# Entry
Amino acid sequence: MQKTIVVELEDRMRHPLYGKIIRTTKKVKAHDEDSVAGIGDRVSLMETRPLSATKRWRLVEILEKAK
Amino acid sequence: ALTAEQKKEILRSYGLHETDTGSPEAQIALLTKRIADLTEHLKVHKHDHHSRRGLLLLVGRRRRLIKYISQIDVERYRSLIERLGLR
RNA sequence: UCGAAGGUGGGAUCGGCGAUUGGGACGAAGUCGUAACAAGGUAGCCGUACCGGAAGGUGCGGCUGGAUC
RNA sequence: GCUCGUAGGUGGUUUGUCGCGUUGUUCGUGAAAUCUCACGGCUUAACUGUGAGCGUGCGGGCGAUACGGGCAGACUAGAGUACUGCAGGGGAGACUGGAAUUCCUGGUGUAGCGGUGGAAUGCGCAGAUAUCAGGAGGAACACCGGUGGCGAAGGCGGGUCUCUGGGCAGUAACUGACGCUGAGGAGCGAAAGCGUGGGGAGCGAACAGGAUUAGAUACCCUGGUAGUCCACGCCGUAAACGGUGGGUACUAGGUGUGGGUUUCCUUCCUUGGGAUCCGUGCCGUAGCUAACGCAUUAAGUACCCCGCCUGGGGAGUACGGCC
RNA sequence: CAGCUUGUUGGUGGGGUGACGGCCUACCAAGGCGACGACGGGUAGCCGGCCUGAGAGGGUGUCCGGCCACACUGGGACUGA
RNA sequence: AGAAGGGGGACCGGAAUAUCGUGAACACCCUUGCGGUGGGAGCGGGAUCCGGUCGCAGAAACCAGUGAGGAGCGACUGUU
RNA sequence: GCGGAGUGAUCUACCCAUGGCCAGGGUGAAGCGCGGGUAAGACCGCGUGGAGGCCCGAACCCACUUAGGUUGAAGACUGAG
Ligand SMILES: [Mg+2]
Ligand SMILES: [Mg+2]
Ligand SMILES: [Mg+2]
Ligand SMILES: [Mg+2]
Ligand SMILES: [Mg+2]
Ligand SMILES: [Mg+2]
Ligand SMILES: [Mg+2]
Ligand SMILES: [Mg+2]
Ligand SMILES: [Mg+2]
Ligand SMILES: [Mg+2]
Ligand SMILES: [Mg+2]
Ligand SMILES: [Mg+2]
Ligand SMILES: [Mg+2]
Ligand SMILES: [Mg+2]
Ligand SMILES: [Mg+2]
Ligand SMILES: [Mg+2]
Ligand SMILES: [Mg+2]
Ligand SMILES: [Mg+2]
Ligand SMILES: [Mg+2]
Ligand SMILES: [Mg+2]
Ligand SMILES: [Mg+2]
Ligand SMILES: [Mg+2]
Ligand SMILES: [Mg+2]
Ligand SMILES: [Mg+2]
Ligand SMILES: [Mg+2]
Ligand SMILES: [Mg+2]
Ligand SMILES: [Mg+2]
Ligand SMILES: [Mg+2]
Ligand SMILES: [Mg+2]
Ligand SMILES: [Mg+2]
Ligand SMILES: [Mg+2]
Ligand SMILES: [Mg+2]
Ligand SMILES: [Mg+2]
Ligand SMILES: [Mg+2]
Ligand SMILES: [Mg+2]
Ligand SMILES: [Mg+2]
Ligand SMILES: [Mg+2]
Ligand SMILES: [Mg+2]
Ligand SMILES: [Mg+2]
Ligand SMILES: [Mg+2]
Ligand SMILES: [Mg+2]
Ligand SMILES: [Mg+2]
Ligand SMILES: [Mg+2]
Ligand SMILES: [Mg+2]
Ligand SMILES: [Mg+2]
Ligand SMILES: [Mg+2]
Ligand SMILES: [Mg+2]
Ligand SMILES: [Mg+2]
Ligand SMILES: [Mg+2]
Ligand SMILES: [Mg+2]
Ligand SMILES: [Mg+2]
Ligand SMILES: [Mg+2]
Ligand SMILES: [Mg+2]
Ligand SMILES: [Mg+2]
Ligand SMILES: [Mg+2]
Ligand SMILES: [Mg+2]
Ligand SMILES: [Mg+2]
Ligand SMILES: [Mg+2]
Ligand SMILES: [Mg+2]
Ligand SMILES: [Mg+2]
Ligand SMILES: [Mg+2]
Ligand SMILES: [Mg+2]
Ligand SMILES: [Mg+2]
Ligand SMILES: [Mg+2]
Ligand SMILES: [Mg+2]
Ligand SMILES: [Mg+2]
Ligand SMILES: [Mg+2]
Ligand SMILES: [Mg+2]
Ligand SMILES: [Mg+2]
Ligand SMILES: [Mg+2]
# Structure
């Protein structure tokens, strides 16, 4: 993405009626000033101002690099 | 087929420590050998559906073992892939 | 430059009517047959093919949700 | 209809860490009226004012790891692999055998044969039926054969050979949760039918004649085409049924059969009884059910996954879409 | 309704805004959204509230209150905090 | 199916001195040849964008498919 | 018109042998590669390739329409299609 990265985030929210716990996955665009990230490459993200049209996150640090 | 010594040859070729038979590596090697033999047989007798089902079962088992070894150890997965063949 | 409205064109989608025509439901006390319920008079069903006014009949394969020794 | 498997859901024992789910407290917020408790005022009520609940939630800090979960490990029980034996109509290809029917040729031989409840159509007298001998051809494999075996299902036995699948038993030899189910998707899938070439003994839709009957487009008889057969494709439908989805744990017994193993009674020759595993039948305890019935091969007691129903016709039909 | 998008996704340099931003512009990459249902069709103001129901739930948005959208239809600028 | 229906087309200048692409002279090495590499002169080609200019008209004259819908017959190319 | 005997395939019909000719554009079959796809596939997309009683169209071969000619330039032609 030429200084941007796409990061999959997941969360769990209880069903309003049945009450089961379910898992849903999302997708956010994160700013990478120096684009160093591959497939996997767990990253912790903190949300910023609207840096671009569809970017509201920035890179904080790289933890648990890809195996 | 896969006679006794035929199995032993692949077992010593792809084993872990001189006696391994149930590791994903040895199991995948033996399954690949069986699959290749079965496909070569199936080029003849194209209507042997009762054996084509067994070939499909072996393919599924090998796929599951490959997935397990890939999830458990990427380096071993890559080594086995280069040693045997994928896509 | 962009820009509402308007014109030209091929399409997309949703409805209405339509000579004629197919099947369905209900009506009466009509006409032609008795196919099923008994072994219902040729046991009954299931898939397919063919045939015949119609229900239906025949063949192939299967079931007993029938019987027999 | 069966099977496989994508995503997904779900998951053995044990150790450590985090504390995301979980839960507790605290703070902020969750407007007012209206909903409720308690009061106050319109003569009462409706109406209205006040105090507290409501506002099921969210954000922040501070406590817990009992369960789910993330990570890092470990174990063998699940699961898979290994080695030794076991049974089998599991499947494909190739070669080959006998009986029988029909047909052909010749011999013997003359007036009937066939068919039914009764007949007639039909066949023979131009030599039929019958009998003998030889030959040609296709289909199906009596006896074994069963209540049996195998296969996911559909299905599977004349014999021999080649190739190949699966299962069961035993040791625990090896890995170490690698497992279960599976939306879509894919493969397999009786008979009938379709395309191309071959084959066609017998049977036999359609069709024809005879017979029954008021009629007989049928049941019966005489014939007879596709088809049934082979090769490669297509079609994907059955009461494809156990009318019962897959996996696991538990829940008295009694009595047959099949494949193993195991000590003992080991000669009580008995290949019997006893123990265990995998099946296959019947009867039967509890339990379930409207009843019939199920009952360790559950329709009983629980869990996980997928599929399906919301009165009967219209209708599994119309339109659209895929093949 | 099974494939949707090209200022569309991102980056760079400018321009623009009270303010971040393809908001606009010139160049570079090929990306971004989709079975957890995009894109498409039908319908509709949302909520506090109101009704019914033991409750969960089912229906509803009218008095009043909060907001949003509109002012014959469609489009645009200016003044001004 | 060239379905149908649309848009652009002239000249001058700039981009533009390898802009790009064609061939490859002077001059660069070695097994010295009818040899190899770099090199880029001179000469030709095409396209695009931006700006300007002229006319009634930029395909410029000559040259150069009309298109669509419904039926009948024969499948079609061909032959008489 | 009938019979006998002969002559003719330098026109025309068909056939045999041996030679020649077909400007220029367009379309893009099989096969061959690469990638995607899978266990393998089937299949799919990019290239290459240059098939066809293929398309447009001169030479060439025809003869559909129309006008002229019709004591013709010509006992069957010319012009435009
Ligand atoms: Mg930026
Ligand atoms: Mg009408
Ligand atoms: Mg009757
Ligand atoms: Mg009947
Ligand atoms: Mg009767
Ligand atoms: Mg009857
Ligand atoms: Mg009939
Ligand atoms: Mg039938
Ligand atoms: Mg029958
Ligand atoms: Mg079933
Ligand atoms: Mg069914
Ligand atoms: Mg069905
Ligand atoms: Mg999965
Ligand atoms: Mg899982
Ligand atoms: Mg667990
Ligand atoms: Mg899990
Ligand atoms: Mg009072
Ligand atoms: Mg309140
Ligand atoms: Mg808190
Ligand atoms: Mg085990
Ligand atoms: Mg065969
Ligand atoms: Mg014969
Ligand atoms: Mg004789
Ligand atoms: Mg005889
Ligand atoms: Mg170990
Ligand atoms: Mg499964
Ligand atoms: Mg499925
Ligand atoms: Mg058949
Ligand atoms: Mg056939
Ligand atoms: Mg045939
Ligand atoms: Mg008749
Ligand atoms: Mg008959
Ligand atoms: Mg017959
Ligand atoms: Mg037919
Ligand atoms: Mg098929
Ligand atoms: Mg069956
Ligand atoms: Mg169930
Ligand atoms: Mg079960
Ligand atoms: Mg079970
Ligand atoms: Mg038993
Ligand atoms: Mg019983
Ligand atoms: Mg029941
Ligand atoms: Mg239908
Ligand atoms: Mg339709
Ligand atoms: Mg741009
Ligand atoms: Mg920019
Ligand atoms: Mg509205
Ligand atoms: Mg209730
Ligand atoms: Mg308006
Ligand atoms: Mg008005
Ligand atoms: Mg207006
Ligand atoms: Mg003012
Ligand atoms: Mg102002
Ligand atoms: Mg055109
Ligand atoms: Mg047309
Ligand atoms: Mg002018
Ligand atoms: Mg033209
Ligand atoms: Mg017509
Ligand atoms: Mg013609
Ligand atoms: Mg025809
Ligand atoms: Mg003469
Ligand atoms: Mg002559
Ligand atoms: Mg040409
Ligand atoms: Mg090609
Ligand atoms: Mg041609
Ligand atoms: Mg001619
Ligand atoms: Mg004339
Ligand atoms: Mg004249
Ligand atoms: Mg003429
Ligand atoms: Mg001419």
